[PDB]
Design a protein around this ligand. Structure first.
Ligand SMILES: *C(=O)[C@@H](NC(=O)c1c(-c2ccccc2)noc1C)[C@@H]1N[C@@H](C(=O)O)C(C)(C)S1
Length: 358
């Protein structure tokens, strides 16, 4: 790294680790397009295994960025349209409240109040159908945003149906492989288990539990190198050789809805750059992140704006992640930690680094 990058990163992240008691962390900065890596602490505290550039972390809800791009790619292939009713792709979904709810609504949390989590009691396919059939919207579609794993997760499952591929197979063949993300996984293979960090929640080593629509909402695991490659791809989609994938990246960074200073993409969320750091820092707090917020439709959606702060936070019980990038500046960061610590501390650290380098 240039010494400048080294210093800004270390003088930001070292205190963050100390204050939040994070056991292990990995950071990548993308600066003028090139990645620089940094690692601290432990992947496995009991086995004294350090964090390396090969360590897998649970991305949690950052997974949604992959789901949003995979959907984008399906739209670009002509397999699905965001304007399609949900019922086109799940004809068993006959309940009247679904009339008017499109794939766009599912993808952008605007279906009318689908809940944050799919209930833990949903264990099978018929349980899932029952859940969505019996869900009662609080709101008309396209009026309020309520962040929901059950919303984007269903989008993900539906989006891959016409391909005939499972979500995991579609993701591997259409996103991970073409982008050379060869250490990024929905299900960690045995060959990579020795690199799979433990997450830490109240001092206990934990991994994410199986759950309905986990793959689509929160189930990706990846290394700091692959995630830097993911930032590079989203920074410069027009360099990707796969046509539909290049377009799906763009579509995921299109602005569909606005609530305050924030625009909703497919998975990604965006703000105009330059950004007021109090907008993003405080906005990342979960009482704000997860609130019911009225949205304004952006009619038609604005294509990916290069002058944007594009970002996503994620957590599992044992991990905390953050990704942000600024396409106009060829600049981005990935922060992966094996403790779930507050979003505002992530975003503050990220902005401190990127603002210094900008
Ligand atoms: C994605 O990261 C989602 N995470 C979870 O639903 C989740 C949690 C959790 C942590 C904190 C509060 C509620 C749930 N534990 O295990 C899982 C699988 C959602 N996105 C996050 C984000 O940062 O956008 C949250 C914290 C808003 S929940």
């Amino acid at each position: 790294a240039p010494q400048q990058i080294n210093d800004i990163v270390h003088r930001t992240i070292t205190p963050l680790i100390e204050q939040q008691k994070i056991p292990g962390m990995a950071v990548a900065v993308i600066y003028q397009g090139k990645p620089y890596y940094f690692t601290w602490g432990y992947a496995d505290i009991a086995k004294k295994q350090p964090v390396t550039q090969q360590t897998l972390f649970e991305l949690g809800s950052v997974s949604k960025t992959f789901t949003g791009v995979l959907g984008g790619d399906a739209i670009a292939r002509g397999e699905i349209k965001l304007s399609d009713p949900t019922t086109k792709y799940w004809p068993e979904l006959t309940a009247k409240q679904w009339n008017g709810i499109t794939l766009l609504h599912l993808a952008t949390y605007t279906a009318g109040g689908l809940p944050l989590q799919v209930p833990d009691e949903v264990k099978s396919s018929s349980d899932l159908l029952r859940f969505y059939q019996n869900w009662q919207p609080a709101w008309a579609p396209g009026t309020q945003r309520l962040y929901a794993n059950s919303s984007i997760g269903l989008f993900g499952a539906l989006a891959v149906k016409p391909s005939g591929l499972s979500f995991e197979q579609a993701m591997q063949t259409r996103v991970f492989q073409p982008l050379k993300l060869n250490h990024t996984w929905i299900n960690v293979p045995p060959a990579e288990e020795k690199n799979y960090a433990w997450g830490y929640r109240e001092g206990k080593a934990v991994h994410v539990s199986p759950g309905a629509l986990d793959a689509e909402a929160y189930g990706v695991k990846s290394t700091i190198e692959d995630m830097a490659r993911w930032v590079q791809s989203n920074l410069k989609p027009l360099d990707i050789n796969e046509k539909t994938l290049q377009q799906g990246i763009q579509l995921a960074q299109s602005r569909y809805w606005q609530t305050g200073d924030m625009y909703q993409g497919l998975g990604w969320e965006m703000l105009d750059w330059p950004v007021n750091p109090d907008s993003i820092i405080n906005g990342s707090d979960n009482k704000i992140a997860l609130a019911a917020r009225p949205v304004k439709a952006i009619t038609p959606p604005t294509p990916a704006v290069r002058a944007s702060w594009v970002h996503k936070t994620g957590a599992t019980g044992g991990f905390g992640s953050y990704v942000a990038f600024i396409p106009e500046k060829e600049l981005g960061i990935v922060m992966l930690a094996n403790k779930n610590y507050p979003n505002p501390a992530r975003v503050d650290a990220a902005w401190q680094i990127l603002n210094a380098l900008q």
